[PDB]
Amino acid sequence: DVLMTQTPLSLPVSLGDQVSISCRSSQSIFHSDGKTYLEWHLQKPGQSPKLLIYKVSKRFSGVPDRFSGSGSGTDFTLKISRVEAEDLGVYYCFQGSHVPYTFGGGTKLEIKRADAAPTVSIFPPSSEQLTSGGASVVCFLNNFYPKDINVKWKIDGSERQNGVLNSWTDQDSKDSTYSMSSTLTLTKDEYERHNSYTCEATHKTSTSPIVKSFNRNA
Amino acid sequence: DVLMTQTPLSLPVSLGDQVSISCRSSQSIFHSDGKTYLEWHLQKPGQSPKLLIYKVSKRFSGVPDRFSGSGSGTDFTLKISRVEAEDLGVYYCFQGSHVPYTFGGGTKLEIKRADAAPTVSIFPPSSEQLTSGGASVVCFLNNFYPKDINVKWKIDGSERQNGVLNSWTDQDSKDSTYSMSSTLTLTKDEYERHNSYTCEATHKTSTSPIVKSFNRNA
Amino acid sequence: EIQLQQSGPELVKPGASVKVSCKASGYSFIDYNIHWVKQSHGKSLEWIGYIVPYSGGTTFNQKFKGKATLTVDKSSSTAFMHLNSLTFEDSAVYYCANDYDGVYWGQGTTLTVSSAKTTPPSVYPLAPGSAAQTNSMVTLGCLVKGYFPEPVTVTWNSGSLSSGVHTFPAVLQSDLYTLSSSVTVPSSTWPSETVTCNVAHPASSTKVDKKIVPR
Amino acid sequence: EIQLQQSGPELVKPGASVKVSCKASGYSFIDYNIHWVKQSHGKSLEWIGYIVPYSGGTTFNQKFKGKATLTVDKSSSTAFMHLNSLTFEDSAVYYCANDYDGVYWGQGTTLTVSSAKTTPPSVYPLAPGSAAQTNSMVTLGCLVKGYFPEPVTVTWNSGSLSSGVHTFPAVLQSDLYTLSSSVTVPSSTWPSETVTCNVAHPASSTKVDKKIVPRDC
Ligand SMILES: Nc1ccc(CNC2=[NH+]CCCC2)cc1
Ligand SMILES: Nc1ccc(CNC2=[NH+]CCCC2)cc1
């Protein structure tokens, strides 16, 4: 199978700047009819993909002239002359020359902004949940940038990796930050066998760990 | 340096009373995080301090509801709605918003009891001490209340301040009174140069000074 | 205008089969190829194969040979994709697309394969516990746990509180979904005023309100 | 449960240095700061500074720069404070404390700096000048002067006389300790019956008995 390799995986950009994305194939995607079947699609969250460019450099109907495609053989490039807000999303290259047709892994464009430390909040299990034999400890790590962050749960000083469920939001349209939710689910009994609960975050914005904790009795 | 001032210095209370202690800073104690890092700690004799309240009004884990904290800017107040035996001790406020962090001088909570007149006893130097070339004249002022007392030593009618060492007991666990020992140290020769030795005390329980005295040649 | 309209979301049990429709309009359907694509985990795109409407001829990605069956109904300008012997790995979003003057995409069809039964969520208000900073802003939360199937709608104060809200994508745990939502408000607002998280789960005809109460 | 356990009391000579340890348990040590505090004469509290375990970074009260050195051993969850070039003014109780969800305090470490050598006490009987007023209740005493180091134990009549006893905290005079003890008994018991103060000073294995006899002297 022809492998399509896109670089970079994610690209922080500034509105109005010029950006270029790369797509390389493991072998030539030249077709016997003299044409090269390389396409570029754009997919925004929650929507279906939309074709931008086909046959390497042909612009699909309605696509702005700021989008341009070039390349030949195994190296292809998509260029956006002046990036706009509506251009943000995931870009995928596709080859339709050799069966099975394949897609690249995608390149995600996000807005670049200043770093921001997460605002961390920790919540002990609600009274109502405990009465059912369950205990979920929740930690919110809100409005931070960049997206790279490591969250660890420490119970009585010991790291707990089992029972942890994480979820992240997409880049916020208003402040360009990211948010994350981390939930530690235990049994009512397990929860009562310990006292110290810590949600620890490691982020570029702080030398030492960013933490929030609580004790089971207060 | 932000100076912390606590008033009063000592507060006599009866079990069950509702009291309020004051702590003031020479300057505002607002920190960058938008917070006010003010703490109240309680220290019992022979023990390490214990946190009661932090961030002006947050109760520390395991601290009974009878403790309440409030204040703002430069004036803070610790309130105990119902004094219990476990609440007797020295209360310290602390500011952790401006380096170097500082503590107040402390407010001592003591048990209030009925007035008690001191039993004063004066003792001339023992023959054993004189043989070694020393002469300590001792005055005990026992089982009195309140604690406020002023003791003066007079040699041949003249007040003597140098060479005097005082030591106090803490409030008695049984009768709630205080006791004190005052020692006047001289050399054998100096003790031999004078004749009249007096230990004089002024206390709430007597309209005139309480005096105990002895003459060397008797 | 050219449009490819796909059938709605499907919830099916493992081992069964399902048919996804792709209705075409605005052009000569019989003359252009219809392709099918699978998108797993909202990321990886995989080409399944295509069908030539006139001949019924098909070309597949070997990986999907047997799993998918492609057909077309010339009379109604509709292409169909049958997925057989469904497994959990078949859960994904499927798209049809054509090769007309470039490429037009269908809106996608979400397929969820599971043995789980419709289950209402347990809604738990999350209020700050033992010390959560006596200052400026306060973050409150709402935990929506153990529901099936998606989706649930979470609002704060019936939609009045929109700013400062973060609702996180649901995660699958023990065959059921769980999601959380946080709201940050001035501490002069709470607990002085009431803050409520409203949760609606259409599948179970559930509508729950949970006030966020102190301690 | 969260605990901060400090090392034991120390008696050191001026000019030397000492290391006070503070072992943490019950939470992730690397996540919170360790502060050090000094308490002189069981009254005034002074903040020395703190250390950030992860980075080793420190913030000090300018008054303690050079005097104290703060370090940490991540593997053993222990913080250390080194007091250097000791002088008499360094004698105090030192506490470590953290900033975990409020403040947890260590039990404290008492440091005594002195160049004094072990010296047994001189015990002197304190009898009222011939007789203090005469009858009802009479107060007798025992002066324990010039010993080092603390402590001394003072009992009356081998512990038989327990009520009416006041033993005062030792005071430092000329680099040595001095303390006094008083006992009050019915005038109908002394001088008829004997009253003796028993003094023991463990450090010097000294044990002395001094019976209180009338006449001041
Ligand atoms: N040789 C060729 C291959 C594929 C196509 C259609 N391109 C597609 N884009 C992405 C998936 C849907 C089909 C046209 C010509
Ligand atoms: N900004 C801040 C300053 C100090 C502290 C810890 N408070 C302490 N209480 C008294 C001495 C030990 C440390 C926490 C935060």
Short mmCIF file of C-alpha atoms in Angstrom, two decimals, chain A residues 154 156-157 196 198 200 207-209 211 213-215, chain D residues 2 26-28 30-32 52 54-55 100-101 104:
data_model
loop_
_atom_site.label_atom_id
_atom_site.label_comp_id
_atom_site.label_asym_id
_atom_site.label_seq_id
_atom_site.Cartn_x
_atom_site.Cartn_y
_atom_site.Cartn_z
CA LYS A 154 -1.40 10.79 43.79
CA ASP A 156 -1.40 9.33 50.08
CA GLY A 157 1.75 10.16 48.12
CA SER A 196 -4.68 12.51 50.76
CA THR A 198 -3.70 15.07 44.77
CA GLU A 200 -0.75 17.00 39.83
CA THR A 207 9.11 24.91 37.04
CA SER A 208 7.57 22.91 39.87
CA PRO A 209 4.39 20.79 39.65
CA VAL A 211 -1.13 20.91 42.27
CA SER A 213 -5.29 18.55 46.92
CA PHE A 214 -7.80 17.77 49.63
CA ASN A 215 -8.14 15.45 52.61
CA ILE D 2 0.16 13.68 57.05
CA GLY D 26 1.34 10.92 53.88
CA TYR D 27 1.49 13.07 50.72
CA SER D 28 3.77 13.58 47.70
CA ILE D 30 7.87 16.89 45.84
CA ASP D 31 4.57 18.77 45.46
CA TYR D 32 4.72 21.19 48.40
CA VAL D 52 10.93 24.23 46.69
CA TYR D 54 11.61 20.01 42.92
CA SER D 55 13.97 22.81 41.88
CA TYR D 100 -0.22 21.41 52.11
CA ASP D 101 -3.93 22.40 52.09
CA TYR D 104 1.27 21.12 58.85
#
